[PDB]
Amino acid sequence: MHVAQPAVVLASSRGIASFVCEYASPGKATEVRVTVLRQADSQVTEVCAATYMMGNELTFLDDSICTGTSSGNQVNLTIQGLRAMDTGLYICKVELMYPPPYYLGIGNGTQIYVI
Amino acid sequence: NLEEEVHKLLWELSEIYHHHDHEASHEALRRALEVLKQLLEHNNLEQAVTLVSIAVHVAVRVNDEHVIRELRHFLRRLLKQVKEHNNNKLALLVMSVKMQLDRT
């Protein structure tokens, strides 16, 4: 499954980054699980993860660092509390959990830059 | 036809996950292991990464330590093969599955 996100994003003067992650949802799915992974430089960590219903706000597991809203086949994620160290490639993994079948899609990642 | 076997399992494991179904998981997971095993031998990693991903989701919730242990070993071979084809997406894909599997 195709997932699209901006190539580069700049953190505001207060390290809050916002980017939209769009998934080619096969028709219409109900249970979507979005995971944001950070790759920097060869180091891979899970920044946040949330399972939400296609059109609602995002109920995050960590309920910190990440906030999000969903609108159709796209989700706008907002990451707070960013320092310069947190600069890296923020990649969107999107899973369609329900109704069956399961689907999986990864973006090519958003380069976020923090000052 | 393996391609269909994955197609059934991706349907079945999604219904099992949503349905929280403890012993439909057992046999579906065992079938998943072998289908995943066959996918590794024939270097069809895109099915393998999708199948193992949802399979790990079912494994952790149902708590089959046998399947988890077997999946700990398959994930390591799967990652290795992905790295050798330099497919970074698939590697990120496998590693994120490794992370949740590694410690839950």
Numbering used by the authors:
A (entry chain B): 3 to 117
B (entry chain A): 2 to 105
Paper passage:
We reasoned that to enable systematic design of binders to convex protein target sites it would be necessary to generate scaffold sets with overall concave shapes. We focused on 5 helix bundle scaffolds with three helices forming the concave interface and two helices providing structural support. The selected 7476 scaffolds, which we refer to as 5HCS (5 helix concave scaffolds) throughout the remainder of the text, have a wide range of curvatures. Our method for computationally designing small but concave proteins to bind to convex protein target sites expands the space of the protein surfaces that can be targeted by de novo protein design.
Immunoglobulin domain recognition plays important roles in immune receptor functions; in particular the cancer immunotherapy targets Cytotoxic--T--lymphocyte--antigen--4 (CTLA-4) have extracellular Ig fold domains that are the targets of therapeutic antibodies. The highest affinity optimized binder, 5HCS_CTLA4_1 has a sequence similarity of 82.86% compared to 5HCS_CTLA4_0. 5HCS_CTLA4_1 had an off rate too slow and a binding affinity for CTLA-4 too tight (<100 pM) to be measurable by biolayer interferometry. We determined co-crystal structures of 5HCS_CTLA4_1 with CTLA-4 and unbound crystal structures of 5HCS_CTLA4_2. The design model of 5HCS_CTLA4_1 in complex with CTLA-4 also closely agrees with the crystal structure, with a very low rmsd of 0.34 Å. 5HCS_CTLA4_1 binds to the CD86 binding site on CTLA-4 using a concave binding surface formed by H1, H3 and H5 covering both the CTLA-4 beta-turn (L98 to Y104) and hydrophobic pocket which interacts with CD86. H1 interacts with the hydrophobic beta-turn (L128 to Y136) through hydrophobic interactions between Y18 and M135 and aromatic interactions between H19 and Y136. S54 and I55 on H3 interact with Y139 on CTLA-4, and N89 on H5 hydrogen bonds with Q90 on CTLA-4. We co-cultured the cells with a range of concentrations of the CTLA–4 binder, and observed dose-dependent activation of CTLA-4 effector cells with an EC50 of 53.3 nM.
